[PDB]
């Protein structure tokens, strides 16, 4: 629609403004129960020819149920927590005796209902498959004949659609040992998840958001294994509750700003260290250094607030005016002269320095732009590919309006070489104090002479 970003050239960085947030902040749990019969041996005399496939089908089904019986740049400031928190709690509640019997009893005919456990938790129940009726009316009245013989083999395939799902269950929980990310459709189909969206206590605009983006919430959803006893094999889905939706939020890309000094290796430079996503949850902002926890789909981001920062809303002031006495404005300085380039949503920032061939080329008119020195910026609807160093990259091709604002070499605002390159986290206040104290030390050394 109206994707935009503004490349600051004072500090070489792009702010991908204009997106809608849809951040999760809570967990919604629900129990999904698949019922199943504790089948005994077939009691069959002879092997026959038509009735063979059902035998290994039920044997593999028994193997599955018995094996699953036997189953039971700012990341350093970031926190860590237990993502599997509420679902394991609900399963632990179900470990108590006489509890799962209530889910068994109340959910007898209605597909979905509400029960309450011994802690007052009353979220939802759902029964996903109906093996009781099919097993006890369509399988054993046929299978338990004298010298057993099915009426026909063409009646088995529907049972296959009632069995293969279980099999999926098998090889996705024997390898993952309880927790699967992302959640497969075999635990919960597309239409069934759409039904579930109309079930948890959320608002209807969030229901529309979920209905439009079933695959993404399917990606972020969790699954935790509950108990297996009394043939009510079940698991808790931990589909995320979504706290805030639709606030504008930006991907800040940062790029090197290093001088092209003739003497190589003597070029100190300070470059911004603010990579990631920023958006205003309530009156503060949520910061995500993890671009991998955040996912993008048609201007809709989806990310996890557990590994976020609840930083104050004054982060745009340092974004526009880096030299402001209100923010720490963390900047990383080093003497490295690295030809590095990044791709934003609507363009490419090249920052190649020294002897490095820098070209931006189309497939229409051949090469079209050449970058000599300094950080340079190209809109995505100006080029198609970029060659820098020895590597090629492809710019994004989504329609939007992008602008380049003229900045300044802030690296020349400081002394040519006082900056240390022996730290991994610093701010403009700390570095300014270091400059002031080194200036005081050298003037004292000159005065004592």
């Amino acid at each position, epitope marked *: 629609q109206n994707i935009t970003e503004e490349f600051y050239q004072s500090t070489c960085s792009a702010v991908s403004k204009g997106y809608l947030s849809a951040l999760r902040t809570g967990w919604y749990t629900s129990v999904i129960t698949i019922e199943l019969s504790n089948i005994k041996e077939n009691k069959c005399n002879g092997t026959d020819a038509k009735v063979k496939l059902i035998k290994q089908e039920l044997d593999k089904y028994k193997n599955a149920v018995t094996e699953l019986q036997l189953l039971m740049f700012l990341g350093f400031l970031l926190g860590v927590g237990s993502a599997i928190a509420s679902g394991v709690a609900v399963c632990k509640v179900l470990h108590l005796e006489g509890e799962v019997n209530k889910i068994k009893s109340a959910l007898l005919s209605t597909n979905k209902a509400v029960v309450s456990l011994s802690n007052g938790v009353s979220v939802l129940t759902f029964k996903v498959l109906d093996l009781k009726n099919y097993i006890d009316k369509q399988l054993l009245p046929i299978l338990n004949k004298q010298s057993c013989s099915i009426s026909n083999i063409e009646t088995v395939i529907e049972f296959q659609q009632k069995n293969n799902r279980l099999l999926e269950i098998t090889r996705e929980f024997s390898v993952n040992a309880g927790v699967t990310t992302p959640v497969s459709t075999y635990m919960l189909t597309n239409s069934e998840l759409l039904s579930l969206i109309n079930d948890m206590p959320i608002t209807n*605009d969030q229901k529309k958001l979920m209905s439009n983006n079933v695959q993404i919430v399917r990606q972020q959803s969790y699954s935790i294994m509950c108990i297996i006893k009394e043939e009510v094999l079940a698991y808790v889905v931990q589909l995320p509750l979504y706290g805030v939706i*639709d606030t504008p939020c930006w991907k800040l890309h940062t790029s090197p700003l290093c001088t092209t000094n003739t003497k190589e290796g003597s070029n100190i430079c300070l470059t911004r260290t603010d990579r990631g996503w920023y958006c205003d949850n309530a009156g503060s902002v949520s910061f995500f250094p993890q671009a991998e926890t955040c996912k993008v789909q048609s201007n809709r981001v989806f990310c996890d607030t557990m590994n976020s920062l609840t930083l104050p809303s004054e982060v745009n002031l340092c974004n526009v005016d880096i030299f402001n006495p209100k923010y720490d404005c963390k900047i990383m300085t080093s003497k490295t002269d690295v030809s590095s380039s990044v791709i934003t949503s609507l363009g490419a920032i090249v920052s190649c320095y020294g002897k490095t061939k820098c070209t931006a080329s189309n497939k229409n008119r051949g090469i079209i732009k050449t970058f000599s020195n300094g950080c340079d910026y190209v809109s995505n609807k100006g080029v198609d590919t970029v060659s820098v160093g020895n590597t090629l990259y492809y710019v994004n091709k989504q329609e939007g309006k992008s602008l380049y604002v003229k900045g300044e070499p802030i690296i020349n605002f400081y002394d040519p070489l006082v900056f240390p390159s022996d730290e991994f986290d610093a701010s403009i206040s700390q570095v300014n104090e270091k400059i002031n104290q080194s200036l005081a030390f050298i003037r004292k050394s000159d005065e004592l002479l």
Partner: antibody
Framework: VQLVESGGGLVKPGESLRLSCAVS????????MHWVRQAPGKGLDWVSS????????SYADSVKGRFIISRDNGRNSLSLQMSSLRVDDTAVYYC???????????????WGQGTLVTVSS | QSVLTQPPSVSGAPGQRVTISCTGS?????????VHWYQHLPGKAPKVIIY???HRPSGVPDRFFGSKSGTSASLSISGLQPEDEADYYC??????????FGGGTKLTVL
């Protein structure tokens, strides 16, 4: 964090017209916006909802498409259009800015000062 | 017309505790949705008294105490004070009518 709005008056029903909200929130993009109306006699009811980009419009079941809502982020203002009208639309209308709950809910926090729109005769 | 039903005929002298009760259907409230209670004094704009049935906003007295259970929410006021002449509401998220306002109870001192 206060709000101001305008657009009230006495108009014959049937014709479309323009109601404005001019909230003085300096950071009017993160907080959800609703419009409600309070009528003499019966109780207040909710009318319209909007948030952020405005891609999740919703209306009360009394008005399906009759009221058309929009907002502009940079001007920090908001508009509602009276596409369809009738006799019970006379009420004091509130531009109400609500906060987000832990789940998703609008608490319907600090309100507007209200503008009377009368449709009688 | 509202799915939220509360009797708008509650009144009492200052000093005692007064309960306000509002009930809804299964789809609102009892489907895990919170209830918000406001005030409607004439003149100055309405504002929140209690939100999500437990937590209170910044400037309110401790007299208001909210609770919810099943499909019913309640507000208790202990030790009534004179300026509490208002009209009080409930607010939930019924799956039909999206944000539903209760009719409100007219509370006045004697």
């Amino acid at each position: 964090v206060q709000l101001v709005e305008s657009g009230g008056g006495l108009v014959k029903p049937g014709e479309s017209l323009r109601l404005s909200c001019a909230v003085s929130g300096s950071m009017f993009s993160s907080y959800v916006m609703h419009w409600v109306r309070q009528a003499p006699g019966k109780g207040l009811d909710w009318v319209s909802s909007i948030t952020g980009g405005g891609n999740y419009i919703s209306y009360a079941d009394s008005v399906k498409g009759r009221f058309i809502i929009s907002r502009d982020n940079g001007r920090n203002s908001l508009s509602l259009q009276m596409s369809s009208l009738r006799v019970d639309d006379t009420a004091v209308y509130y531009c109400v800015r609500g906060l987000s709950g832990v789940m998703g809910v609008t608490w319907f926090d600090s309100w507007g000062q209200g503008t009377l729109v009368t449709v009688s005769s | 017309q509202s799915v939220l039903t509360q009797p708008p005929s509650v009144s009492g002298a200052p000093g005692q505790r007064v309960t306000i009760s509002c009930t809804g259907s299964s789809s609102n409230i009892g489907a895990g949705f919170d209830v918000h209670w406001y005030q409607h004094l004439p003149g100055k704009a309405p504002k929140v008294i209690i939100y999500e049935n437990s937590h209170r906003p910044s400037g309110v007295p401790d007299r208001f105490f909210g609770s919810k259970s099943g499909t019913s929410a309640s507000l208790s006021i202990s030790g009534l004070q004179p300026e509490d002449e208002a009209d009080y509401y409930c607010q939930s998220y019924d799956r039909g009518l999206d944000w539903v306002f209760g009719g409100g109870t007219k509370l006045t001192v004697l």
